[PDB]
Structures are given as C-alpha cells and as structure tokens.
Write a protein that binds this ligand. Structure first.
Ligand code: HEM
Length: 392
C-alpha cells in the first residue's frame, strides 16, 4: 500500500522522514496524487544522485503524471518552453553542453562580494530604528533579488516587479496560471537578451550570448530564468529558515556574535538543519534501477529527500539538533552528482555575509512573536511566510 503524504507532510516533513527512514532506505509514497519512490537514507540518496537510470525528462514526466489522473489528450508557448529547457530538465549527453557554456561566462565571480556587502548594508540601513520588522520581506527576500539580478543585468527599475512574478509562480498551483505568468516573463526575458546582444555589458546575460557552439534563444531565456528564480526564492528562504534557528536557539547566537570563526560552519548547519529545498527535482526511470537495495521499476518517479539524508542518524550525530559547531561537512543540501547547485558558492556567501551583518549592527535581534504565531507555507520549498523580528 503506498503511503499518502498530505498537508501535514508539506508543513512538517522531517518527522515523517524519520518514521520511514528506519523502515527502509527507500519508500513508496504518494505525493501529489502521484505514486513515486522516496530516497531517505544518506548513502542511498548519494547513490541515487549518481545513477543514470534516474532521468529528468519533464516531457515524459508530465504525460506519466497525467495518466494517473486518466486525462490522456504541442504548440509549446514561450513560457512552457522556459520552464522545461534548463539544465535540471535535461540528461546527458545534452546536459554536459549546457553546463559547459553557462560556466564559460568571467571574473564577474570576483566583485560579487563587494556587491553583496553593499546591498546588505543598504537594506540594513533602512530598517534601523523601525522597531519590530518582518526580516523576511526587508532583508532576506530583498537581498538575493538585488544580488542575482545585478549579476544577470535586470535593470534596477525592473527588478522588484520581476520578484512579484517569481513569487506568484511559486505560490501558483494550477498549470494555467503558471504558464500564463511564465509567458509574461519569457517576453521580458527576451528584450533583456535582445538589448544585450546589441549592448554587450558586464552582466551574465551579455556573457551567455558571447559563449564552436552557442546557446539558442530557447536556452538563453530558460537559463536566465532558472538562475533568477532559483537564486531568489531558495536563497532567500535559506536565510529565513536559518535566522529562525539562530533566533530559536539563543545561546549559539551569542557564540556567533563574539566568534566570527563560527560564521563559516554555521551556514553548513543551517543548510543541514532546515534547508529551503528538502527535495530533489523529480526524475522518472528509463529502466529498472536498484537504489538502497530496493528494486525501483521503469516508468516510475524517483525523488531524493535531501532533508532525511541530512538528518540520517548514521551520517550525523543527534541529527535533529542545531550545533553551529559540528562537522556538518557532507550535507546533500546543494545536491550531488552531475546536477549539484552551480551557484552554491553564491548562496553560502550571501548567507555568510548576511548573518554577520545582522548580528553586527543589532545585538538585541530577537523574535517578537511566540514561536507558535509563526506558520509555514504549503510548498515543497520549506518557507516561513513571516519572520517578525524585534531589533533593538
Ligand atoms: C541556498 C540556496 C540554494 C540551495 C539550497 C540550492 C539547492 C539546489 C539543489 C539541491 C540543486 C540540485 C537539484 C537536483 O539535483 O534535483 C540545485 C540545482 C541548481 N541550482 Fe541551486 N540552490 C540554491 C541556490 C542557487 C543559486 C543562488 C543559484 C544561482 C544561479 C542556483 C542555481 C542552480 C542551478 C543552475 C542548478 C542546476 C544544476 C544542474 O542541473 O546541473 N541555485 N540547487
């Protein structure tokens, strides 16, 4: 019998991961009305992330997912193509080409730090004296929006409105509204490319065009999109997940206040504890695969649980405990294998420089509501909806 996963799972997963982790390293679950297999233990997850039998063909996925519901029916619109023609929806040998090209774009790697520190201080200089504030909508969500945007070259006057469409496509559930919102951005993210094919500047759009092979408009849009959205939501959610733990456990907060030698290691324990992504990109199966010692059939969905793996009592000690002073090296929070977050270095830098600056200016940073008045959203992205901190 396939176990069913409900609204309770979405909000509070890590208990469920722990109940099923002891039973077996992989489980048969029902997430989204879709029977899939869930990889929970650390080694099993590492291995499922290094196996070619797990294919990321969104084309095959959608048709297979519609068949569970019975609805068995094209002109793929711009926005439909934007959502499915990025690295994460592609398998080798075609993934290798794309990842080469996007990495070939530039010493823009350096000077990323100055930008972050600048925009951090700008954001922080605005909330000073404002008493109680929502840290998420004033520091966390504003920062990566400004950081990733200036890398891609999204003009300042256009940055914020792109964040709303990002946020809405995240909150949106129905396919219709998604494809509609996506067609909206896809057009803007085409003039933005077009301006830069005529005005080569010092941004990542200009350099993605300039990279033999080249990246087609199809993949230039798709890549400029994926870097924008995934470097906005998941980055900004890691900050807010991390600060909730840094405010929920106060003893460690003050250790980090005096000793900035802990700043580096804490970021790893933030990613390890509550990561913004506790789940893999779905992947279907071309052939029968053996992961965790359990046979997974062909034409069957497989997701890897990055949360349960990070919380496996074999890999880590008291895996459900926030200790900024742990050998947390080895987390699967940024993925493993051919995929693996290309922009993980930027996520660590943002959080590292963010958390330090918050503690620097504000030594009375504290939560202004009971931990009970805080509520998490119904997304596979572990979010908080609100973080009402009380600076002092
Ligand atoms: C704290 C922030 C982030 C976390 C926790 C995170 C996590 C992940 C994970 C787990 C994957 C692999 C998914 C899978 O294999 O199913 C991934 C992929 C990816 N991420 Fe991130 N990510 C973060 C931020 C970013 C940022 C800021 C960027 C900026 C460009 C980015 C760009 C990418 C790309 C391009 C891939 C595709 C990997 C591939 O297909 O080869 N991510 N991310």
């Amino acid at each position: 019998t396939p176990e069913v996963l409900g609204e309770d799972f979405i909000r509070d997963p890590y208990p469920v991961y722990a109940r099923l982790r002891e039973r077996a390293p992989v489980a048969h679950v029902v997430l989204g009305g879709a029977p899939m297999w869930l990889v929970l233990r650390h080694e099993a997850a590492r291995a499922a992330l290094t196996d070619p039998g797990l294919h990321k063909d969104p084309e095959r996925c959608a048709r297979l997912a519609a068949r569970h519901a019975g609805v068995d029916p094209a002109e793929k619109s711009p926005g439909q193509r934007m959502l499915v023609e990025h690295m994460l929806g592609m398998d080798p040998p075609h993934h290798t080409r794309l990842r080469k090209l996007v990495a070939k774009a530039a010493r823009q790697i350096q000077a990323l730090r100055p930008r972050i520190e600048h925009t951090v201080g700008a954001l922080l200089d605005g909330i000073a004296g404002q008493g109680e504030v929502d840290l998420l909508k004033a520091f966390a969500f504003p920062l990566p929006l400004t950081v990733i945007s200036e890398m891609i070259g999204v003009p300042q006057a256009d940055q914020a409105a792109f964040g709303a469409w990002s946020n809405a496509l995240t909150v949106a559930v129905q396919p219709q509204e998604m494809h509609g919102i996506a067609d909206r951005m896809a057009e803007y993210l085409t003039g933005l490319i077009a301006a830069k094919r005529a005005a080569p500047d010092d941004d990542l759009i200009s350099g993605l065009i300039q990279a033999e092979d080249r990246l087609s408009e199809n993949e230039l849009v798709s890549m400029v999109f994926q870097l924008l959205v995934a470097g906005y939501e998941t980055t900004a959610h890691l900050i807010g997940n991390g600060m909730l733990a840094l405010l929920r456990h106060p003893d460690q907060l003050a250790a980090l206040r005096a000793d900035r030698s802990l700043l580096r290691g804490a970021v790893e324990e933030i990613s390890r504890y509550d990561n913004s992504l506790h789940l893999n990109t779905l992947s279907v199966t071309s052939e029968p695969v053996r992961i965790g010692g359990v046979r997974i059939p062909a034409d069957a969905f497989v997701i890897v649980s990055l949360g349960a793996a990070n919380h496996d009592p074999e890999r880590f000690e008291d895996p459900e405990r926030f200790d900024i002073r742990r050998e947390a090296g080895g987390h699967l929070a940024f993925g493993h294998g051919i995929h693996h977050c290309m922009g993980a270095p930027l996520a660590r830098l943002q959080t590292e420089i963010a958390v330090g600056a918050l503690l620097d200016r504000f030594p009375r940073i504290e939560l202004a509501v009971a931990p009970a008045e805080l509520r998490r959203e119904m997304n596979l992205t572990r979010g908080l909806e609100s973080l009402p901190v009380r600076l002092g």
